[PDB]
From Swiss-Prot:
Annotated protein name in UniProt: Solute carrier family 22 member 12
GO CC list: apical plasma membrane; brush border membrane; membrane; plasma membrane
Pfam families: Sugar_tr
Organism in which the protein naturally occurs: Rattus norvegicus
Reaction(s) this enzyme catalyzes, per UniProt: urate(out) + (S)-lactate(in) = urate(in) + (S)-lactate(out); nicotinate(in) + urate(out) = nicotinate(out) + urate(in); urate(out) + n chloride(in) = urate(in) + n chloride(out); orotate(out) + nicotinate(in) = orotate(in) + nicotinate(out)
Compartments reported by the entry: Apical cell membrane
Topology within the bilayer: Multi-pass membrane protein
Record field: transmembrane: 15-35, 124-144, 160-180, 182-202, 210-230, 238-258, 307-327, 334-354, 363-383, 391-411, 422-442, 451-471
Length: 472
């Protein structure tokens, strides 16, 4: 009988907007902390240190010192034992360290800890660890908001994000950095889930719309915030601190947001629920029907389609999170990318939804997965000669794939006895977080041809979309 009480106290109004703003604003920095492993763990051009150069015709010295590499470049992992002056066989690996190109980035973790050459596999493992941390933190938090509340967990998760992010920027050794990024990921997942649930609960029956949409926009924009912040600060120690600093103020000001009143009723804290509802009514200025609340009212108040949905969620998560953390391979001028994936995301998603809803729900679901997979696959076919076409296809593909989590959540998830969709969205999204940890691990196939990762990332979504047509 809670919706009757909610209609009695308010609905829409003023408080539901202020709370919405204050709970959606964290989402931008939550995205910023998640896409940060693209300007922090960036790989600049590296050479082998040689005594003849870099102190104790520069082009001639570079030619004699290092053997040439295959890709029209000097070798990045080998060095001549002695200066081969015969150039107007016997090679040894780098042992005095490397030298890097300090022209776009001042200091990355790759530069700091030498995650190049033989120890190349370490880099595509930090992102996998981070995503596994998100999955684990989201799994634990579910049975954590039923014994501690729903607003306290949000504030404590804010504090954990801030402290762990600040501490992770001062570590001198790689495993400590990985562990603290794991903790950051878990706390971020907790923040995500608790914010979503809090936005759902306090809103009236029209929460399915706006509210849930207002979340996504958060990400989209956030993307651009990540891009701008990255363009701002170049060093990697001063990027993590600058990103994790706001969360302390977020935790400080999150001490006044009212806690969800529906949860308080089921546990037995009637007085707190009364105070909460009265203060919400006072904020909403609907202090006319509140006198009816005299405790007693609240005292009396107290299979194939599923598999298709799981496959679609898995394909979307796997492709997006195994391809959008390596944007240095999709083009150039990285700061312009990762800042064009929201400005393309919004118009494309709205236009595609509006245009394809009328044709049919299954048609829209199918067309949202074949198109971006084919777009990504077509990136290989084009050569390097046209860079604009080389980069626009990837942006269009990512923007179109971003519409999947919107189309398959609000328009889909009704493919069931139609009792409540909250038991289906989470079930589908579990495979989305469980398919991203199996993501960047594909990029470990750089050896044995470089086209295989892109080929897999292009064939998986198209196969999932083609299988989606087999509903009957
Ligand atoms: O927007 C989200 C959240 C939603 C959880 S949520 O709102 C909730 C609702 C109801 C009950 C409990 C919790 C999320 O976890 N991912 C995600 C994380 C890791 C891997 C894959 C997906 N994305 C997402 C979607 C598209 C593009 C990027 C990110």
């Amino acid at each position: 009988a809670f919706p009757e009480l909610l209609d009695r106290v308010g609905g829409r109004g003023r408080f539901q907007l202020l709370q919405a703003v204050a709970l959606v604003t964290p989402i931008l920095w939550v995205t910023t902390q998640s896409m940060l492993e693209n300007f922090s763990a960036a790989v600049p051009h590296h050479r082998c240190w040689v005594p003849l150069l870099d102190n104790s015709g520069r082009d001639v010295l570079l030619a004699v010192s290092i053997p040439p590499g295959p890709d029209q470049r000097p070798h990045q992992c080998l060095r001549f034992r002695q200066p081969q002056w015969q150039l107007i066989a016997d090679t040894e690996p780098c042992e005095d360290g490397w030298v890097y190109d300090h022209s776009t980035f001042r200091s990355t973790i790759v530069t700091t800890w030498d995650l190049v050459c033989d120890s190349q596999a370490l880099r595509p493992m930090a992102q996998s660890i981070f995503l596994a941390g998100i999955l684990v933190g989201a799994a634990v938090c579910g049975h954590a908001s039923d014994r501690f509340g729903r607003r306290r967990v949000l504030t404590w998760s804010y504090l954990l994000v801030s402290v762990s992010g600040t501490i992770a920027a001062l570590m001198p050794t790689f495993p400590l950095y990985c562990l603290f990024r794991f903790l950051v990921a878990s706390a971020v997942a907790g923040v995500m889930m608790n914010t979503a649930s809090l936005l759902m609960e306090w809103t009236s029956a029209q929460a399915g719309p706006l509210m849930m949409t207002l979340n996504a926009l958060g990400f989209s924009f956030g993307q651009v915030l990540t891009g701008s912040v990255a363009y701002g600060v170049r060093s990697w120690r001063m990027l993590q601190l600058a990103v994790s600093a706001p969360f302390f103020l977020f935790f400080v000001y999150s001490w006044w947001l009212p806690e969800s009143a529906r949860w308080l009723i089921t546990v037995g804290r009637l007085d707190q629920s009364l105070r909460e509802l009265q203060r919400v009514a006072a904020v909403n200025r609907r202090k006319a029907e509140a006198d009816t609340l005299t405790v007693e009212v609240l005292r009396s108040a107290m299979r194939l389609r599923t598999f298709i949905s799981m496959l679609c969620w898995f394909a979307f998560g796997f492709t997006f999170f195994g391809l959008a953390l390596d944007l240095q391979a999709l083009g150039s001028n990285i700061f312009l990318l990762q800042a064009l994936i929201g400005i393309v995301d919004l118009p494309v998603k709205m236009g595609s939804l509006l245009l394809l809803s009328r044709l049919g729900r299954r048609l829209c679901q199918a067309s949202s997965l074949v198109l971006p997979g084919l777009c990504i696959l077509a990136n290989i076919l084009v050569p390097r000669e046209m860079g604009i076409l080389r980069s626009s296809l990837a942006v269009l593909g990512l923007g179109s794939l971003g519409a999947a989590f919107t189309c398959v959540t609000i328009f889909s998830s009704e493919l069931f006895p139609t009792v409540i969709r909250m038991t289906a969205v989470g079930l589908g999204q579990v495979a989305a977080r469980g398919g991203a940890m199996l993501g960047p691990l594909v990029r470990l196939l750089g050896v044995y041809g470089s086209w295989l990762p892109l080929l897999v990332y292009g064939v998986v979504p198209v196969l999932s979309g083609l299988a989606a047509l087999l509903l009957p």
